[PDB]
Amino acid sequence: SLKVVIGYLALDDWEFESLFPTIEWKYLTHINASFARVKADGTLNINPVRKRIESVRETAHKHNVKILISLAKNSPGEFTTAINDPKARKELIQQIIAFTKEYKLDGFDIDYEEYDNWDKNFPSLLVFARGLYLAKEKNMLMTCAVNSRWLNYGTEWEQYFDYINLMSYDRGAFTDKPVQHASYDDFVKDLKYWNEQCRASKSKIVGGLPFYGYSWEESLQGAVDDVRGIRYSGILKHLGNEAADKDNIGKTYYNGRPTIANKCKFIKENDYAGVMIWQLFQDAHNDNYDLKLINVVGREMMEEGHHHHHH
């Protein structure tokens, strides 16, 4: 039960060409290649990953890191349509298992985020999850990216997944008011929710970590996206290296090194499965190597507990 470090890798990220060669594989156990998009008819839009999936797979495997294909909605409501429609649902299940097998991947990750009428659609989602599990091959890993506390997943969902990755971030971030989107408090409560309420074994609960934040600084409007999002790399660039050891400077809130470490430590101290990251490319660049968040994760998850004699 060694800790896992599941890193999301967006194969269509604008920084791919420049940053792919710098991925710190020694601090990863798995990578989720994102995303194969789910269409309403149960088929997949693999344009975001088709051209790079094979190369990433070979590179990951060469470094002894597993690779899974992550699946998200093609557009608003398409994933919901796919699972509520019986034939589409069965098609989607086949598509997923096929893609995984064909591309010789280590498994698949389900990132379902259709929040409209959540409880009404959940039974169908659960049926989809069970069907996926029953249809998958033995060796295939099956994981999911999930919310905690504000959405109910019940107590049956748990059983079908090898890893349940908590998206403990983006809380209260979509308003005109500055706030910490991924607090330590909410991370701890999210974990407790999944172990105690969803009855998921701690050995499969994975705490999600953000390598980005949000800024409400007027002066940074030219450095944040449509939702005020800004990568850790952009934070250090615009706010200076002192930002690496804080969660906030002015009206910019994110997860700095101390907090990333504190989250990893809680995972370790309370026997959780490990951590997940969204997303690897948002980390600092080699010009700020020593300040990278992945290294904080590496020190806490691979080294702090790995020490042995006869070095």
Side-chain angles (χ1 to χ4, degrees):
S1 246
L2 282 63
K3 300 292 175 272
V4 297
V5 177
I6 304 179
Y8 267 101
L9 193 67
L11 273 54
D12 63 340
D13 196 86
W14 66 278
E15 294 195 272
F16 189 91
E17 290 297 321
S18 170
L19 305 178
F20 182 56
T22 74
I23 296 302
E24 198 63 70
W25 303 100
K26 70 174 186 176
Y27 291 152
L28 300 173
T29 59
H30 309 69
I31 52 166
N32 290 338
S34 64
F35 285 109
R37 297 289 179 171
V38 174
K39 302 174 71 172
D41 67 346
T43 61
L44 307 175
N45 159 30
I46 63 174
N47 294 320
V49 303
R50 178 177 60 186
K51 302 176 184 175
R52 290 159 162 161
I53 188 64
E54 303 172 90
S55 298
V56 176
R57 172 196 69 201
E58 224 56 16
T59 299
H61 283 176
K62 215 73 217 69
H63 290 272
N64 294 146
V65 173
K66 299 295 183 55
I67 177 170
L68 299 70
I69 177 65
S70 186
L71 299 131
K73 67 173 75 172
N74 183 59
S75 79
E78 290 199 60
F79 204 156
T80 294
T81 297
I83 65 171
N84 279 327
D85 284 358
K87 56 167 56 200
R89 175 146 50 62
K90 295 177 177 183
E91 180 62 38
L92 179 57
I93 293 177
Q94 294 298 305
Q95 296 270 312
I96 296 171
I97 299 305
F99 184 94
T100 303
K101 284 194 173 186
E102 163 183 294
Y103 282 105
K104 305 171 179 173
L105 303 181
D106 301 293
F108 46 89
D109 170 67
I110 301 303
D111 177 13
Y112 181 90
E113 300 189 52
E114 302 266 44
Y115 309 131
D116 185 63
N117 299 319
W118 179 269
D119 295 334
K120 179 182 179 181
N121 300 309
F122 192 70
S124 291
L125 185 64
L126 186 63
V127 173
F128 167 62
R130 180 184 172 67
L132 249 187
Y133 177 78
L134 298 171
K136 80 176 195 62
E137 192 150 53
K138 167 189 294 300
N139 269 44
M140 301 186 153
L141 291 173
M142 183 170 144
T143 68
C144 60
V146 304
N147 276 288
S148 308
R149 298 184 282 141
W150 64 280
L151 286 183
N152 172 46
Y153 285 78
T155 57
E156 306 296 42
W157 178 260
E158 171 282 309
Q159 69 185 133
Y160 303 116
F161 304 89
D162 298 284
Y163 296 111
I164 299 173
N165 304 332
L166 288 43
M167 303 188 280
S168 193
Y169 30 74
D170 308 315
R171 279 200 171 78
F174 310 117
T175 78
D176 61 304
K177 177 196 61 179
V179 316
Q180 169 53 64
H181 84 283
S183 73
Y184 178 80
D185 189 56
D186 286 317
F187 177 81
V188 168
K189 289 174 171 169
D190 281 359
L191 294 168
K192 173 178 185 182
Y193 173 77
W194 273 95
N195 175 52
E196 292 174 21
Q197 295 312 108
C198 299
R199 295 180 178 295
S201 173
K202 281 181 172 182
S203 57
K204 67 165 67 183
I205 298 176
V206 175
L209 306 173
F211 278 14
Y212 66 98
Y214 295 92
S215 177
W216 286 264
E217 292 289 6
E218 309 59 60
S219 63
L220 297 182
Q221 259 284 244
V224 301
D225 68 17
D226 58 304
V227 94
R228 300 199 184 74
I230 178 170
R231 306 183 171 206
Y232 179 66
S233 55
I235 293 175
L236 295 187
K237 175 182 181 62
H238 289 291
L239 298 183
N241 300 337
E242 278 193 354
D245 307 308
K246 302 175 185 177
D247 282 343
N248 57 282
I249 292 181
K251 309 171 70 63
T252 303
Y253 291 81
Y254 52 102
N255 271 195
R257 293 193 299 180
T259 286
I260 289 295
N262 292 335
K263 291 185 174 173
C264 290
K265 279 174 153 61
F266 185 84
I267 289 296
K268 292 142 60 180
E269 290 301 332
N270 301 87
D271 295 328
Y272 279 104
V275 290
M276 164 273 281
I277 302 168
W278 176 274
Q279 42 118 151
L280 300 172
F281 293 136
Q282 310 169 311
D283 206 346
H285 300 183
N286 292 69
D287 62 329
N288 279 312
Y289 187 77
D290 296 333
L291 299 177
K292 294 176 71 190
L293 295 186
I294 187 61
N295 296 335
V296 176
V297 171
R299 287 192 283 280
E300 305 301 314
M301 304 300 242
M302 276 72 189
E303 309 174 357
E304 194 175 313
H306 173 71
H307 292 122
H308 64 203
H309 303 291
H310 301 174
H311 182 48

